[PDB]
Amino acid sequence: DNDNSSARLFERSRIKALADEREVVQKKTFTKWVNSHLARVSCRITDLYKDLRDGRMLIKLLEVLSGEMLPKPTKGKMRIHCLENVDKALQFLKEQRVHLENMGSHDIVDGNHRLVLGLIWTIILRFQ
Amino acid sequence: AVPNLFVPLNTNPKEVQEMRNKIREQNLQDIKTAGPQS
């Protein structure tokens, strides 16, 4: 149990710490990059994980980046309308033949950090 | 022949041990560094 405790110590300290530092830095940088393009319209996000849930701001960002007119979001405040709004942006990304893997509407709505960061990174790799 | 085909010859064995010790030391200091910027 002593070496088991040491292994749990190692994978509790180092694996958590390096990943958390990297994702914090990536979160700040992605927030600045999104805020630069979203400032053309009167829109601004404070937290990347929380403001991207409703799916409206994702539609605004994709409209700014792509340059054509996406369908307007579903008029609602429920979870189902939230899922619909995220799915609209995901389907519009499926138009542009950008390859997204393990990406669903419920993953963005629930607020999984790694998949949201990967979605932002994929958008950056496409539209730069 | 060619027994040493996969590896280069005349390499100092001390350098590998020094770099392994450096990676070992990073754990003791547990300095947290972010990944390389793209």
Add this chain to the structure above:
Amino acid sequence: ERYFDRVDENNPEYLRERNMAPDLRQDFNMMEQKKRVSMILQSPAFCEELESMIQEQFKKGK
């Protein structure tokens, strides 16, 4: 601390101490106990005989 007192890599001619076979360890000690090379040179009566024998064997031939 003997281990701090001396280092194996500081002196190569102390590094020779570690890598000796036991019979090679005796051969050096016994042979410098005997001092045969010193004995032959210090002893004159055999010495000038060897001197002149080499010199006058060179004298006529080889």
Add this chain to the structure above:
Amino acid sequence: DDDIAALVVDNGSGMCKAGFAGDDAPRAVFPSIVGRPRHQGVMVGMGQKDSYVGDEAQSKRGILTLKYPIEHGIVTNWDDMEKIWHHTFYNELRVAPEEHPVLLTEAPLNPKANREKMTQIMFETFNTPAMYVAIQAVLSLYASGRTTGIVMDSGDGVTHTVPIYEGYALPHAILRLDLAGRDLTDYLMKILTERGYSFTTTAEREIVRDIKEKLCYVALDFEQEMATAASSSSLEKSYELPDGQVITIGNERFRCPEALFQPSFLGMESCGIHETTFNSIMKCDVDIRKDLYANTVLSGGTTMYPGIADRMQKEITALAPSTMKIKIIAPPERKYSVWIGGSILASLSTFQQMWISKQEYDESGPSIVHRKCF
């Protein structure tokens, strides 16, 4: 060159690990599964997700069927492997594959087509500038830090022993055994039936694996431990299912890992891991055996059972001559050791010569990997 660090990806049958060179620990560790739904989908507007891969495939395992792309160290399904690699590169690390080279690990004795297809996939689709393929048990010796020793690596797919003396590896003494924690999980699932518990679906196999990782140990003496378990109930432990039910594993705890030393419980004719290590030692020359006796290295996640080192040392001492000194070296970080070795191999200034360039692949096809690497 200085700021650019090659990615290190350890790719076993059970779990995939990935990180940057020069790091002590991998950034991303996640299981290598690909799951797909099977039931009805009736709620309209929830979105469509065709495949689930990685850790979030485990979270929704109730409504999914789970498939392993790698079986016995061999990539049976390549599309799922591409899914895993894409999820590793983009979602987990957020790095462009064009920026950095990639270092991969594999089993010693594998089919040639596996290496060829690995090279072809990592050049043609991800478009990497350089790539190298290495052996896991060799990287374990890099992590240990010694020139000589014998490495016994036991993962989820395969177990293998390689000896290395003074940086020279003997190919004829390399031994491979298809006995890993996968078959141990299957054996535990089989022997849990006689106590009244039935696990059949692929989702319950993860529960059985968790039970194995929490409540298993290796007895130092099998018969004495069996007599103790028959005499008293002090060996019994309780586990709680996700639905709140409580089971009592009892006698099975030291019977599941015992199949490593006696494969006859599984019907296999092969020898145990201790006999395999001893036979790999005696297949070498006479002179190096003493050194191979002194630097036995354990690695892989399967060797994380409590008491594995004492039993291994006792069995090897019983097999070996009495005048030799037998010690087993098992670091606490032996689950990740291969990856650490990879980083140590990836950051060397000399190893920058040994990368396989993209131009060389373009000239030579996917057959360049056998001429280089090992």
Add this chain to the structure above:
Amino acid sequence: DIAALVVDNGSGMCKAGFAGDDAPRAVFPSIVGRPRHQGVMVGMGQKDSYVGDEAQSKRGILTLKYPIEHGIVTNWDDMEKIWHHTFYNELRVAPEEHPVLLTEAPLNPKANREKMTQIMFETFNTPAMYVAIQAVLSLYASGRTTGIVMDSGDGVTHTVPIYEGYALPHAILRLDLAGRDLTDYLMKILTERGYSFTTTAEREIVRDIKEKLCYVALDFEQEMATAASSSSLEKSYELPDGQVITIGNERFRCPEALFQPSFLGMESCGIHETTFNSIMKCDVDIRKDLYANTVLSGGTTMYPGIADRMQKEITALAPSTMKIKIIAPPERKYSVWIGGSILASLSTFQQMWISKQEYDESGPSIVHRKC
């Protein structure tokens, strides 16, 4: 104070030391090893070829081959490698600053001396080098100028008689029966006990076994009777892998091939008969001194009981009125080098050195003029 160098070469052993010293500075086997297994470990120490004492450490991963066999070199490049290792790694002295002294077998082909001289002047820029007979230097190390000497090395066995400092060329006898052939015979007779040795490292192991646990029988048939009728003549050797073997009967069987070559099937006679014939070839008037002074040299003559058996076998063939005595110095392994350390130290020997400038107008044959 520039001092000469004495380098003694034989098949399996190279010694080197400064002139006038009691002890040679470097002693190491004359072995060349090349790796045989697939070397896969990036960044750590590998070399193309190992030589000397370092090569003997890594016997497991190396193929070991000898550049010299039977006193005749087979590959000159390996000999250059050994000489370079001796000059640079062992003594750490420049070869072009100090003179070097060299030794060889008495009877040898023409080309060996010429090639050796050419390599020693051209490669290392030696200002002066001289060639001497090994057995003559051994007799000088014993310190008597007369008598018949027997030098048996790992390459070849030879007996030469020297009277008043002159070795008679007609009376020199050479027999190709050395310690390496005895090692091969010991391996062949250890095959029948159940222990099998085939590789070169196992040959070195068998050689160590022979050095540790061999002796010469005074009476061959009586020792066979004793070893067959009892278990007293049994010793146990402990292998480097931990295995234990019992040498048993073979201990006095391997060295007895020195006296009876019919075990190996060689046509030539025994070593004592060779010494007796070499004494017979000399003049009668000096024969008394040849029976009065006989010294043993070489590592092969370190078997226990060699002196008593040699004296008995010579006395059997000698006339009854003759007196037979055998001299065996305890340091008979390194006698030749000691003689060299004598010969370079003399004040009349500085004119005996071969001039570097004289070689330019003479050429590679100059040693045949001067030696």
